[PDB]
Amino acid sequence: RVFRSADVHGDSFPTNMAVKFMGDELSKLTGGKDSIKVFGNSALGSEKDTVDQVRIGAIDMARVNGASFNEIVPESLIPSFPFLFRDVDHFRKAMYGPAGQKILDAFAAKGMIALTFYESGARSIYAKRPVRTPADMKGLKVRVQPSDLMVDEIRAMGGTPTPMPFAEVYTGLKTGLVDAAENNLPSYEETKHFEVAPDYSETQHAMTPEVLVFSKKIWDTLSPQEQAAIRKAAADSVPYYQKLWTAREASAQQAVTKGGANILPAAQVDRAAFVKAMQPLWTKYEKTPQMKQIVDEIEAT
Ligand SMILES: O=C(O)[C@H]1O[C@@H](O)[C@H](O)[C@@H](O)[C@@H]1O
Numbered sequence: 255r256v257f258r259s260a261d262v263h264g265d266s267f268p269t270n271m272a273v274k275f276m277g278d279e280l281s282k283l284t285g286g287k288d289s290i291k292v293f294g295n296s297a298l299g300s301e302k303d304t305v306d307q308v309r310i311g312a313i314d315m316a317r318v319n320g321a322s323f324n325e326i327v328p329e330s331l332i333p334s335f336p337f338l339f340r341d342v343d344h345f346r347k348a349m350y351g352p353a354g355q356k357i358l359d360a361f362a363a364k365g366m367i368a369l370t371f372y373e374s375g376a377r378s379i380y381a382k383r384p385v386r387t388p389a390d391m392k393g394l395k396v397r398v399q400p401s402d403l404m405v406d407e408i409r410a411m412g413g414t415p416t417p418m419p420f421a422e423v424y425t426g427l428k429t430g431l432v433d434a435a436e437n438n439l440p441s442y443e444e445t446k447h448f449e450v451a452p453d454y455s456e457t458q459h460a461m462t463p464e465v466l467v468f469s470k471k472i473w474d475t476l477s478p479q480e481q482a483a484i485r486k487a488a489a490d491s492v493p494y495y496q497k498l499w500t501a502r503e504a505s506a507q508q509a510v511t512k513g514g515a516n517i518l519p520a521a522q523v524d525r526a527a528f529v530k531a532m533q534p535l536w537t538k539y540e541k542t543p544q545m546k547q548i549v550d551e552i553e554a555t
Pocket residue numbers: 262301317318319374399419420436437438441464
């Protein structure tokens with residue numbers, strides 16, 4: 255059948271392109287039985303809404319950010335932990351290894367099959383002034399995703415967090431409802447947030463993954479061969495995504511800079527001040543010995 259899949263991003267964005275690529279591959283692996291259509295631009299709803307729809311089987315699939323599972327799948331909190339990953343190479347090795355697998359496995363009890371992660375770079379604060387330390391965060395109305403952890407992260411940085419859906423952030427910034435948010439460079443560019451919040455400060459406070467989830471209610475009706483085809487197509491989409499994403503990080507940085515944005519390099523941001531402030535949250539959100547073990551497996555990579 256045609257599986258319906260949700261994404262907040264536009265059609266040309268790397269996540270949408272990767273799932274469309276998966277769909278093309280899936281078609282061939284199933285003798286034309288299956289394909290995927292990606293409804294971008296938050297057409298099917300916010301991330302929160304589309305996750306609830308995937309869980310009841312109203313839509314087949316969604317490519318969403320890991321933060322959107324933080325109140326549903328406890329293990330999803332872990333890779334949103336602040337300053338957990340040293341760098342992108344660390345994220346890749348740990349998240350496409352056994353530790354990442356344990357996180358994927360936890361989705362199944364919550365009515366989702368987590369097929370793969372996709373990298374999402376590092377999230378950084380942007381605003382109408384640069385931010386080198388927490389003092390600089392004070393008084394900023396900072397949009398966050400609707401995640402208790404993300405609320406706590408921004409509060410710990412010194413800002414005042416306000417949860418909002420991704421599609422609404424641009425209007426929020428343009429009209430002063432909020433005056434800052436945080437994200438990777440491709441998202442900063444795609445949404446035009448860089449036009450109204452031109453100071454992008456590389457706090458690199460989180461390296462939250464994307465997750466591609468499939469509705470378990472729909473999954474449970476498929477044969478093992480069909481399931482295996484879907485899993486292979488998802489796995490095969492990752493190097494395709496990585497080529498697009500690495501190129502997009504670079505082109506986004508150049509595009510926003512040419513479009514007037516000022517990037518404060520990570521080296522000039524008081525990483526020390528932010529690590530001080532944010533570090534206790536790990537212990538707050540380790541709600542089981544299994545979560546502690548996953549964190550340890552990531553750190554040991
Ligand atoms: O901040 C957000 O809501 C967005 O952040 C982006 O990095 C993720 O790609 C997107 O899935 C999230 O919806």
